[PDB]
């Protein structure tokens, strides 16, 4: 099969977005290969001076549309539409104009600029999980999309969940979400979409909505505070104000320090 | 102690405190690599304690503290130390050459 | 990775290199601390003076005490070498008999 | 280079603007006077008055 | 041992019968391996059952 | 490039000409400088001998170390030649040129 | 950044296209102001500016 170009619903499209690794992302001019199903994307990319080669092993192109087109399939971002010729299409519907690419947290929906450094947990409206008996059970943010689905808000933190493909999701409990976040952790590894990480029990505070876990790697990152306890957090955050910023504290000054004592001791006797 | 007082004449009193302060500072520096709290709090305690001493040993104490603890202390601590040391002369200078 | 134990081993090796008369008292303190930490409890009863001694021995920072001994021995060895080179020695009991 | 400020974000740059202030003495050569004065004034006021 | 006792996060094996215990025990940071030789589990219910 | 690389190799080769017992120190320092460039930046805090050694080995680039070693080696060889000029050689059998 | 008032660049297909600060000084050229930032551009000799 060879991909073809279609121009249906061209007047309803504002822009285009790229899907890489199952997660939507913004498009940069430096990218060199895509999988495309649209002809107007050539004019969209050429006006910015870009060129590309078409291949199936490259991120797909999806068009941001202002009209509800297609239907929702669990595990897939946006909506899926099939052309009269059998070719499939992808679109990004929206409710309000100020929409870029939106990911799903277990409780709320938050926009993001990069999946790797955001509070994103899932990127699909509907997802299906394996139950206790080993059978698939559908879940959705909105139960009206598919009959029998379970709301995402019913999920609980610190609980193991397994999808149909065997992936594991584990998210810690939180007490504040938004521009600033506070999290609590236990002595167990937590996993999110495509990335599992190990963390220790404690409490962390972040000035930004980026993903936060209790370890040395995140502790070294700027704007991140963590501690074994709430009281310990204040001491940890106030420590650097009276301590140097490195291991430059070479103790080799003591020889010179004692030189003065030796000199004065000898001089007094003489 | 009587034998020690037999020698060094009048300056044994100056020598004793100078040796004791050097030993205490050496111990503090030895405890540095594990307890990172010490460089600041010990410097503050030392600055507070230096008031209850004679000027003769106070000058040596200030010189030793400035030689030893300078390269491993935040700048603002040093500037506060300098200001607190020099206020007693800033007052005199301002009174005698600037005040009205 | 972590390498604190290797650093402590290197410190002990360098201390053993700079052998003096007072190394034995430090080794005794270290072994006594280890012994008290390992058994404790069994033979401590009444005698608050004994409890104070046990606590003082256990709380001694051995791991950060060898380094001070290093600098203490360095000046002594430098002074001894200076005396040997510049000034000479008359006592035959010195261990300079190697040369 | 002097006169150049940088940071990961707008708040990060503002926070990092004060990085040389906690640096051990011996990092600036000419501009040390203004940095010293900016701390001296704050310290003398906040102590001697309040 | 024929005696009911409280539960702590230190324990590591139980004989589980109730499914919701798996979610309840996870919230305390504990992990366990199911073995029938380990002490059993009981649930507190207001309703008169059994 | 030729002029930017052949000079360093020539200096390294010339360094072996003025051989001394301290050549192995520079040889080990050269290995240390390269070793903690693709590795290290780890092993966290605590201890002080390891960090002191790390600071010492990363003090200056290799070329500066080579030039500084060359300076001292040249001075040492000049002093040895000056000593050999005045006082005389042990091997008077060959009659050298001073006899 | 820009070496001279007027320059020349290759298009997507490699054909040369003249560029300058003002189009009035050279008919058929395209002004610099139309160039978008964060975009790779190439000249006759392969020089790259972004």
Tokens of F14: 């010339």
Give the other-Cβ count within 10 Å of A27's Cβ.
19
Nearest chain C alpha carbon to F51: C7
Question: Which residues make Cβ contacts (< 8 Å) with residue A123, sequence separation at least 6?
Answer: A22, A23, A24, A77, A103, A104, A115, A193
A251–F55 C-beta distance less than 8 A: no
Give the sign of the dihedral formed by CA A122, CA A125, CA A126, CA A131.
Answer: positive
Cα distance between residue F54 and residue D2, in whole Å? 29
Query: Does residue E6 contact residue E42 with C-beta atoms inside 8 Å?
Result: no
Kindly report the backbone phi and psi dihedral angles of residue F51, in degrees, each rounded to the nearest multiple of 5, phi listed first: -65, -35
Kindly report the backbone phi and psi dihedral angles of residue E37, in degrees, each rounded to the nearest multiple of 5, phi listed first: -75, -20
- Closest to A139 (Cα-Cα) out of A124, A125, A126: A126
- Closest to D21 (Cα-Cα) out of A221, B80, A253, B41: B80
What crossing angle do the helices spanning B55-69 and B38-49 adopt, rounded to 10°?
Answer: 170
Q: How many angstroms separate the most distant Cα atoms in chain B?
A: 57
What residues of chain A lie within 8 A of the CB of D20, using their CB? none
The HSE-up count of residue B20 (CA atoms within 13 Å, CB side) is 8
Q: What angle do CA A111, A116, A119 make, to 5 degrees?
A: 45
Question: Which residues make Cβ contacts (< 8 Å) with residue A5, sequence separation at least 6?
Answer: A36, A37, A38, A39
Residue owning tokens 């003769």: B56
DSSP code of residue D21? G
**What are the C-alpha distances in Å from C72 to residues B58, C75, C79, F37, F92?**
26, 6, 11, 35, 49
Taking one residue from A and the other from G, the number of pairs with CB-CB distance under 8 angstroms is 15
Q: What is the helix, strand, coil percentage profile of chain F, to 5? A: 65, 0, 35
Nearest chain B alpha carbon to D25: B75
Cα distance between residue B55 and residue B89, in whole Å? 14
Cα distance between residue F55 and residue F35, in whole Å? 13
C-alpha distance from B94 to closest chain C C-alpha (Å): 46
Cα distance between residue A87 and residue A267, in whole Å? 97
C-alpha distance from A255 to closest chain F C-alpha (Å): 15
Q: If DSSP codes are grouped into helix, strand and coil, which group holds residue A185?
A: strand
- Closest to A76 (Cα-Cα) out of A36, A138, A24: A24
DSSP-assigned letters across all residues of A1-15:
-----B-TTGGGEEE
Query: Which residue among C3, C8, C67 places its CB closest to the CB of F43?
Result: C3
Q: If DSSP codes are grouped into helix, strand and coil, which group holds residue G10?
A: strand
Cα distance between residue A46 and residue A40, in whole Å? 10
The technique by which this structure was obtained is cryo-EM
Burial class (CB in 10 A: 0-12, 13-18, 19+), A191: middle
β partners of residue G8: G18
Q: Residue B32, Cα to own-chain centre: how many angstroms?
A: 18
Cα distance between residue D42 and residue D49, in whole Å? 11
Cα distance between residue G48 and residue C19, in whole Å? 66
Cα distance between residue A201 and residue D10, in whole Å? 31
Pairing of strands A195-197, A190-192: antiparallel
Q: If DSSP codes are grouped into helix, strand and coil, which group holds residue F67?
A: helix
Cα distance between residue A66 and residue A79, in whole Å? 12
B22–A249 C-beta distance less than 8 A: no
Q: If DSSP codes are grouped into helix, strand and coil, which group holds residue A92?
A: strand
Residue F39 at interface with chain C, using a CB cutoff of 8 Å: no
Q: What is the resolution of this structure in A?
A: 4.9
């Amino acid at each position: 099969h060879v991909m073809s170009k279609h121009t249906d619903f061209s007047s309803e499209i504002i822009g285009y977005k790229a899907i890489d690794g199952g997660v939507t992302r913004d498009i940069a001019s430096t990218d060199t290969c895509f999988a495309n199903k649209h002809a107007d994307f050539d004019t969209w990319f050429s006006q910015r001076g870009g060129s590309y080669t078409n291949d199936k092993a490259c991120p797909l192109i999806a068009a941001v549309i202002t009209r509800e087109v297609g239907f929702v399939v669990p595990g897939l971002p946006g909506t899926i539409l099939r052309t009269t010729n059998g070719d499939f299409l992808h679109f990004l519907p929206r409710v309000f104009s100020a929409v870029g690419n939106i990911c799903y947290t277990p409780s709320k929906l938050i926009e993001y600029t990069d999946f790797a450094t955001s509070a994103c947990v899932l990127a699909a409206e509907c997802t299906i999980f394996k139950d206790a008996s080993g059978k698939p059970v559908p879940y959705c943010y909105d139960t009206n999309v598919l009959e029998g689905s379970v709301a995402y808000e019913s999920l609980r933190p610190d609980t193991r969940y397994v999808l149909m493909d065997g992936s594991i999701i584990q998210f810690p409990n939180t007490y504040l979400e938004g521009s600033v976040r506070v999290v609590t952790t236990f002595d167990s590894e937590y996993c999110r979409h495509g990335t599992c990480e190990r963390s220790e029990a404690g409490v962390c505070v972040s000035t930004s909505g980026r993903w936060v876990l209790n370890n040395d790697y995140y502790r070294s990152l700027p704007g991140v505070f963590c501690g074994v306890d709430a009281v310990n957090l204040l001491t940890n955050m106030f420590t650097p104000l009276i301590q140097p910023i490195g291991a430059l504290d070479i103790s080799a000054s003591i020889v010179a320090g004692g030189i003065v004592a030796i000199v004065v001791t000898c001089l007094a006797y003489y | 102690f009587m034998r020690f007082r037999r020698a060094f004449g009048e300056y044994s009193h100056v020598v004793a405190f100078n040796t004791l302060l050097f030993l205490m500072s050496f111990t503090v520096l030895c405890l540095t690599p594990v307890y990172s709290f010490l460089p600041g709090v010990y410097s503050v305690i030392y600055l507070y304690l230096t008031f209850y001493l004679t000027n003769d040993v106070s000058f040596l104490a200030h010189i030793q503290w400035m030689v030893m603890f300078t390269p491993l202390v935040p700048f603002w601590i040093t500037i506060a130390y300098i200001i607190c040391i020099s206020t007693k002369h800033f007052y005199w200078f301002f009174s005698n050459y600037l005040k009205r | 990775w972590d390498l604190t134990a290797f650093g402590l081993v290197a410190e002990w090796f360098l201390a053993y290199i700079l052998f003096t008369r007072f190394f034995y008292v430090l080794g005794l303190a270290a072994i006594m601390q280890l012994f008290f930490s390992y058994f404790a409890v069994h033979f401590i009863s009444n005698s608050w003076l004994m409890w104070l001694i046990i606590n003082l021995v256990q709380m001694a920072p051995i791991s950060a005490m060898v380094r001070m001994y290093i600098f203490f021995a360095s000046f002594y060895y430098v002074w001894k070498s200076y005396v040997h080179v510049v000034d000479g020695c008359n006592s035959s009991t010195c261990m300079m008999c190697y040369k």
